[PDB]
Symmetry: C3
Subunit: 284 residues, 3 copies
């Protein structure tokens, strides 16, 4: 069955949030695996567990708290998803992307998406931050898309373009901000490739993904960007490179979830600082 949410379901949820907080966010942030710490910088924060918000799904993955937090971050009013949804949990893309449309109805204009990703580009090192300049939607190639089914004209057009999904102006700002931080390592930039999961990749799959032109691999984000662009939200996002993908059969180890979470904590002070500074000029 295609999207089971009607336009009214989104507004009902939006009305409920508006009726339970005085906060009116302009920016929305989605926190990935081991990135839930970004919420700690919010002032005047109000938290809502996903389970208490009508129509909201629930995050079942370790490293995803499952809480919507409103607050002020470096002067800008924003709402953060401390934990997100993935298709490997059993969620159809229309459930995975529910919050994005609700955000649009709350008056939000900018969406910031983050995630933990495996590094495909050889020049990447664990701990690197990669600005997502583009993506490759593998599930979309087969028809698995959050927009499949009747189009809701109240959100956007039937055939939205994706060539300009990641805002160019925001990416320039990200680079200027990084230089101001005095970081020794350069801010990376590249293409993110999404696949279903939940298992980690084989050596053969990784070589293929790299040869397709991808720099980092992950199991989320893309469906949210698609829905976000469909409804006209400005999108900006980045991947925290938590591990280097195994490219040789002499497997000197293998990817594991705790290592990615561990990496998130490791890069906590850096990402939070970066996101906090980025708030200045979103624009508005």
């Amino acid at each position: 069955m295609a999207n089971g949410y009607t336009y009214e379901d989104y507004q009902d949820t939006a009305k409920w949030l508006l009726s339970h907080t005085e906060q009116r966010p302009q920016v929305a942030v989605i926190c990935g695996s081991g990135l839930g710490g970004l919420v700690n910088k919010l002032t005047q924060a109000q938290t809502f567990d996903y389970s208490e918000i009508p129509n909201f799904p629930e995050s079942t993955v370790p490293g995803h708290a499952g809480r919507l937090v409103f607050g002020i971050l470096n002067g800008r009013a924003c709402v953060m998803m401390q934990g997100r949804f993935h298709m490997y949990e059993g969620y159809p893309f229309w459930k995975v992307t529910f919050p994005v449309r609700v955000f649009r109805l709350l008056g939000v204009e900018t969406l910031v998406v983050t995630n933990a990703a495996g590094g495909l580009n050889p020049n990447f090192e664990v701990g690197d931050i990669m600005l997502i300049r583009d993506h490759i939607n593998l599930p979309g190639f087969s028809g698995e898309n959050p927009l499949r089914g009747p189009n809701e004209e109240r959100f956007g057009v039937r055939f939205p373009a994706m060539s300009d999904a990641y805002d160019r102006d925001m990416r320039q700002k990200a680079h200027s901000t990084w230089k101001q931080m005095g970081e020794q390592r350069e801010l990376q930039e590249g293409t993110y490739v999404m696949l279903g999961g939940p298992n980690f990749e084989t050596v053969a799959e990784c070589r293929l993904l790299r040869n397709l032109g991808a720099d980092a691999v992950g199991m989320s984000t893309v469906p949210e960007v698609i829905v976000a662009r469909h409804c006209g939200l400005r999108v900006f996002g980045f991947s925290l490179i938590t591990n280097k993908v195994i490219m040789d059969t002499e497997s000197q180890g293998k990817a594991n979830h705790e290592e990615v979470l561990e990496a998130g904590k490791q890069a906590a002070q850096k990402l939070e600082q970066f996101v906090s500074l980025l708030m200045a000029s979103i624009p508005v």
Copy 2:
């Protein structure tokens, strides 16, 4: 759930059509986006809205009228689908391909498939006509296939071959016919790649598709060709190159549905003329 249509459902629909028209078509034509004008050349035409034919799905995409038209085209009796179905509308492939099997039961022997496609091959120009010599079925790689589920032996075999899907003899005829038209631009020929949609591709996805060896990209056709070959229909098809795919991050624009429809009208007199001439020697 796999195919919900039983063999009797196809014949019931076929019987209904046979009982409402004296026309006995030997050729079936499926019109894509902005190609609905091909019907205007039919003599003794009888139209049936998809909504009035038992078991028939409905086209919901602008540029797809949703009408089955019987008529005589340049001496040959044929039936045309003015508008088709796509998986991005919410239709499973077994619904998308319903008409093809009904055509087989009407006595049809040849299927002509057309579509509007984005150009991947650098040598293609907007307005070009590309004969489809082969295809790449991305959704099929993952199991999304109109033949998934119990095989109906009354239509074809369990494991049909696809290496000879596009009739070689028809393609030669197409070239000889094109030369007779006195066209300045050459008739192109290549591989069509199908993906789910409904969103348009990212730059990264386009570079990948081109590197996979594809010449044009679209969101239909392949599932119909598969079912058509399974039941033994001779298949011939072509893509109208409506736009050049964006391959560089310096996006000097972006794909949109109206531009493709606009292109269809632009190439109306040419395609109609070409299809009309092709009717001579289908064979029979």
Copy 3:
């Protein structure tokens, strides 16, 4: 709907088998198309039709008998699936992989997977045996995965690694064993790529698969390996190259199911002999 089997369903089926046979297998073998002959070497064999075992699905593909056979093979106690399940039959991956988890609950420690595959590597010849050193899971790229949905902690972790799926020690043993057989043709080794089916590939698709780095193509195995590794089973497998994939538009023929079955019978005495010898040192 994600996995419809609860942990108790697997154990119920395991208890039933334990209550109907004195055999306690340590190795499990899954026989592919035209490979059902491997069962003929079992001593003290007890057969169960899939239809009589609670919760077990049924094989509907010619070349798949649909019987679970317990027996002694060259000193080792094992259970064989004479015929397997495929997604193209209409089965979700959670149904396709049901037997693997039951095997784990029977006390099995090693899983041997076999299949008939089309050859992509130019150096392969019909009749060749290719040890699977790795795989590429196309359906998995889109989210079609037997592990999708809530993770059952009693079987394995949420994010299992796959880089070491095919046991290195078993592959070395396979090579030493092959040399002892006095075979003139070398034992091949490579990457297996799985796609949905049931139709055979186009020339364009084959060139693409080869360029992705695949050596053989097939419509099964991978989902079983994934579930097997998730629950900690040692995995070993091989493909019987039944035909050479058509890579040129001058199609001097085309793939067909009987040719693959015919090839299986052709290589019967060789594979059976090889599997029988491999039983020595699984280990235990």
